[model samples]
Target chain A: FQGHMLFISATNTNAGKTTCARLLAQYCNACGVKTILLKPIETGVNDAINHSSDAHLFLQDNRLLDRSLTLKDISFYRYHKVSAPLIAQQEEDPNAPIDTDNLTQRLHNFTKTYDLVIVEGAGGLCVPITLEENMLDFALKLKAKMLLISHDNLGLINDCLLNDFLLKSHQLDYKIAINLKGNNTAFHSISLPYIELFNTRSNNPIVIFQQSLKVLMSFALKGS
Target chain B: FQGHMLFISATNTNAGKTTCARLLAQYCNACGVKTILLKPIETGVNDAINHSSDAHLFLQDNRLLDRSLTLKDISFYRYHKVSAPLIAQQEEDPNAPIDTDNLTQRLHNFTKTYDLVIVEGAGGLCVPITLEENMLDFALKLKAKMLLISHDNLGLINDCLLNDFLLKSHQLDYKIAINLKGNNTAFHSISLPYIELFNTRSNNPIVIFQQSLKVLMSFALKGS
Candidate 1:
């Protein structure tokens, strides 16, 4: 492949995938790298007024990561309800069943065209998209490398432990990053030390949230 | 190996491990089976008065659990600080380092004596015990069948999915059950369906916390 594809997933819904995605897009802007976003299954979005979605980060404002990319180009499935993709699809967009085969095929075509395709997955890895599939299925189908975003907090030890293990077990290229938010003394004292201990011995080290620009810069360079 | 030994672990701390552990012990009492509770690493204890530690429900001057079992029998590591085991160990009892060899040997020895042994882990599966080990390492060393307790609320989808996967990946016989306390409509509608879908296809079905007596009762029968 001439370029690269990265799929950003998280431990849970509010683990700051969108924030990380936007920041990654912004990084691409500074480096003048061609990148396209793929949020194939997005919920809690209003279609009427073109209300702010993750695409708003680049489109409505200054990043200008991709001038040609529009809402349709960025997002394939948008639902009104802020819920899991399958439930959102079932409740809000029941008529149009999620077409996974088509979803992957479209994403594959984008990968060929764009220097770097950044796919922002909704919810967690196993979040259902259809009766049979979840978010990770899409990521696996696209054969995209993963950047797992975990919210740094008390419970993240288990989240990171299992997610990191799963990614490694799947034999996929992945990096984990903590999304720094609020005041979490426990994270720094207990969790971070343990995480750092493991990271020291890990084959693939995790990205610290505060010092993530260096990691993002690598992606920008890889895309260019 | 005639009787089953269960190690109760959770996706996170305060996921009702003690509540579920107590229920299992009470179930054992009803069955008239000899069972012992092993809570090797316990933090957040008031040693001066032995406050509401997990061992209290069993040994509060009543015929609740085994008469022979004492606080020292159930717990090996007791710390005053309420935190991760390793952190609490470091801060509270730095002089006494955690020795996994002796701990696992003691558990295995007790396993032969009792009809069933229910060991409640201090924290989540990946929670640190030492610089070198986490809770799962102890669980793995003992080869104890896991009873994973997940708090039934928001973000449990990730917790359940990851923890379940990790157990299965390690080739361990494990079951998961929810600790239903608060109303998580999101959990019921969203997380439940996805997990149910996977369960139908898998050989192991998770225990629904509400109707869990049958699963626990199976252990009672096995012990008898």
Candidate 2:
């Protein structure tokens, strides 16, 4: 809570939120910041980090957040099945569902207790955390500054615009982090100009968060 | 050539369209109904079943369709490295690319001899087929009766609704075939009611395409 919190979000899943979170976590932690990366309602974790099946494990171990803060640090790792947060919760308990409310209380508790918390929204802003609303609504309630990770692909423009529109509609402030995953390859580059147009139109910090694990590890090494 | 054509689509990749398509083809075919299973735009042929991949090998081995009438019977099969239909079109060079007119021309050719052509639209209805439009638009043009084969796991309602809306928006007639794909749990039943609602709206056929290939074979055997 002492340092500024950056929310890493995106237009879609696999849109590189984890990558951005990892890079931001690495970058922030390297700068002598005690960053806490929390997935309050992480999907694909059977137990804690040791038993986590989600692909977020790569980010957990390497580039983002201090590895010291384990899954127990966050309250609701929630459901184990690899699915959308709300659906996972509902499937777990049809009558008593665990959603953004559970997520919010957990966020309030974690952020208030931590120094710098990088909250990764489960998927896109409008992604449902419950039948009524979405994870975006919860993030807006958290008021965490957001960093949207977008891919350089064909649907990036539409996806980015949809995410941007959701965040903007919720009055949520956001910065975009462009992941170099599959960039400059085939039709993925079709999204680059749209990214440029989006960045040019907005003053909100749009950083192309691109750095190899080698560079990140070197930075971590220097800091250590 | 006088009978009706019912097609199945879905919202996610690997959402059980082929399983249902094969079954329905058998179902209709066995009822002394001369039915044609149209495998439109088989992209992942190396390893997919209904997609002319490995599954096709199993299907052909079992004589699902006469081996001689296999690839030659279909309207289109654009082989590519990528799964996204939109990306496939880009690879074909749009200036010299497959057009709606030609695609329809070929499909119409299929409808001429066959009593009923069960046209399978590639991927999700909203999946990109052309930069200008998607499979939904293509379905609209084909005038094929649509039946969505949704994986009845989680978030299927939204996925199905979004797809239904896309198709409905284009004024295409459609139905639902909620596939309980290997997820034989209480939790998987969540999408059944939504499928019912989708059925109500369309006032068209809605079948719960089961995992039991035996039932399909029974129907086919009775036909024999």
Candidate 3:
């Protein structure tokens, strides 16, 4: 188990996990900590619409996209289809399955090299990286505490709770991050009670803004 | 105590509880069920901007706003603030507290008049309708089974699960309705693992759609 490594996941897709991961990496780097960001698997990578993969975006944010490290160095698996990793892998090459063990070994190797290894999952934790493997499986193998990202929307509470239940059931340590500007709000109202209700049952969870890199650093680096 | 009544709630605001309630009411009415929709407490009212209250919108959807029933008839409490019921009520008139017991009796009276009562909460189940009263309190008093509305978003799974946990904890029977067009989707994907995960622990739950009024009718009238 590497103390410097943290798995960043979301309650759902497009929940700002990559943005959070990038900010975290930036924070660690600013603090003079050598950090490397990795996306274990990425989907919806379109070269026509977008030149770079999500891993490349992370590298770009870290100012390493143009450097020596390639996309394969940061991402173990990359897919062009905007689907779950399991289906993506099946469609990309049905004969060759995603090597879960190899990915885990890669993570171990990365942890040995970097002071902090920030591994961001493709989608939500429940999403299947392969038909036989999920993000949770990878997290368990990596022994990484989760920095679960969520948003301020009507469905957020349920999403967050489901993740909490699954993570707790698996005996995983997690810290929740709620992003206010995550969605379009019909009413510019503060959402609580649900947050309050969630707080009553679980451990302390942190609420963060999408723009607050400094706020991210405080939680991201705590107890590390 | 009444089986004809169904309390429609959401995981958060604009989750389409009103739309669900209206559709369920319309279906019930079509079946000669004589359903009545009520928004016991509503906020976000602005008269200056020519903006109608949420209660009025619900009434308009039911085609009752132009009829004999006034907005006040359907809604027991109204506020001008675009916020949760608790905060809205506090700011509107701190001297006037929302009478929770009287509201419960009002629901009892409505059930006696109509064959079915469809009470839609202002926001999510956890939203406080008053300082000491939440939608949960109202649901408990009316003995209404919940029809929880959610949508497709990044944080949806967590939001749905949170709603599930709360309703289950309160010993309220509920069904889930997911409004697919409720949020912007980067990928139009089927979200089932989270639903499957939720169904494993609870009673066999049903997930429906916002567009399928016929689908809603089946569930609404089933075992009734």
Candidate 4:
């Protein structure tokens, strides 16, 4: 699979990785560019009464990418008890170090086939991939560009610091973006000065990529 | 009122100050320990309504502690429409900086009277109290032992740092704790190890007081 790999990560889970990944991929696809979303490892499974077992995002198909194919086409599609790297380690090698090498190789193989590939990580930076290997380690191995997500309120400084440390220490290509909204805050108000500060001065780029068709057009153009 | 002050604070709004504060108060009260639940300074009527008006009805009253006075009388309730220290500043000097001298005086007076006063600060550590008095200023002015309340997620390290920094800068006393669960996923999966690691390494005492009952139980065993 030949595709340009774009790795998406978060400071922690529900940092909107799936939403961002889906939107980003959808944006590119709407513009008629070749793209695929690879959610290699899914740690969460919300079971239904009728189903024997269930995996969330199992039925989610990216309509924007290809009308014929769902998100599963390029995805490793693991519906498991644990997170991505951990499951991979458990299945592949009992004693294998939970390094991102195998995942990277898989991505590299996909890169050979597809125009662009978006890979999302499980949880935060130091999530254990194996006994020793963590998400950050694999992120480094992938050599994929990064986008860091943070919330607007308290402790953002620390998350940004640790996130930057991991990316920089691992030598991963990356940028940070903070989601400035409080928990249970229904409406988000983005103050101009705050927005400007984040977009310009943050350690990483705080791109407020809204859901807009024009942005999708540009993304498609870039991917093409 | 002459007793030790245990100050509880958070990094952001709705980070669970009232919940923790009330819980601690209830826990202590249940153990036949005398505890004063003090809301140092509160802003906005809505917060008060949730914390006060509806709170009494929503949450069961703590019977273990003093019930001599009306449920409302025990609470150190001061409602200010204005935000931060300036509201108090305007009340005093007109041009006087946000002088929480009044607030400090009140807190000091309470400290002198109560045996164990649990003081709850407004919002996070750096959250300002008055025009001249920020939360840090309030902490210093009151000279209370601080407990940092943080959400369970990736960036708690930052919250811990900010609280510690403010405490250190002012030469005040403080401890650290993770309060709210970020989301369902975060609630179940996020490790408490990171929190422990930071607390153990930091200059302050870090306790994951996720439940106030635990603290109350300990206080009963130790103090009583």
Top DockQ model: 1
Q: Write the per-residue lDDT of candidate 4 for residues B1-224, one digit (tens) a residue.
A: 25666777776556677677777766666666556676645544454346553234212343334455343443333344433333433443455454466656765665554566666666455443442345666777676766667666554544454445445656755556667553445533434544444446556555666554675435423432
Highest lDDT model number: 1
lDDT of 3 at B206: 39
Clash pairs (backbone) in predicted model 2: A1-A114, A1-A115, B1-B115, B45-B53, B49-B55, B86-B128
In the range B96-177, model 3's lDDT, one tens digit per residue, is 7778788878877876667777888766665566545667778888777678888666546545655665666667667777
Docking class of 2: incorrect
Better of 2 and 4 by TM-score: 2
DockQ for model 3?
0.17
List, residue by residue over B1-224, the lDDT tens digit for candidate 2: 34455566775557777777777666666665566666667664444334545235324633544546655446455554445555555554445444776777677775555556666766566455665656667777777677777766654554454444445555755565567756366434444543444456555534566743444333322310
Cα miss at A39, model 3 (Å)? Answer: 1.0
Q: Fraction of native Cα contacts kept in each candidate?
A: 0.63, 0.02, 0.13, 0.00
TM-score of chain A of 2: 0.75
For model 2, residues A59-167, the per-residue Cα lDDT tens digits are: 3653344455555564355666566666667667677665566666666665554456677767555455665666656767776666777765544444344344445
lDDT of 1 by residue, A1-224 (tens): 65577889998877898887777766675567666666777888887877678756534533344456677766788888767787778777779888889887777787666677788888888777887777778788877888899888777777787788788877566788889876766677766766766789888877775578667657434532
lDDT rank order: 1, 3, 2, 4
Docking outcome class, model 3? incorrect
Clash count, candidate 1: 0
Candidate 4 global TM-score: 0.56
lDDT of 4 by residue, A12-54 (tens): 6666776666666666665555566666555544233322211
lDDT of 3 by residue, A1-224 (tens): 34367888887777788777877787778787778888878887865567566687877765542367766777877777666676667778678778878887888787666777888987667566665567778888887767888866654554565566566667666777876663565313445544664466556654555555665555555664
Tell me the deviation in Å of residue A126 in model 1.
2.0
lDDT for model 3, please.
Answer: 0.68
TM-score of chain A of each: 0.87, 0.75, 0.85, 0.68
Q: Report the poorest 10 consecutive residues by lDDT, candidate 4 chain A.
A: A50-59
What's the number of clashes in each of the models? 0, 6, 13, 26
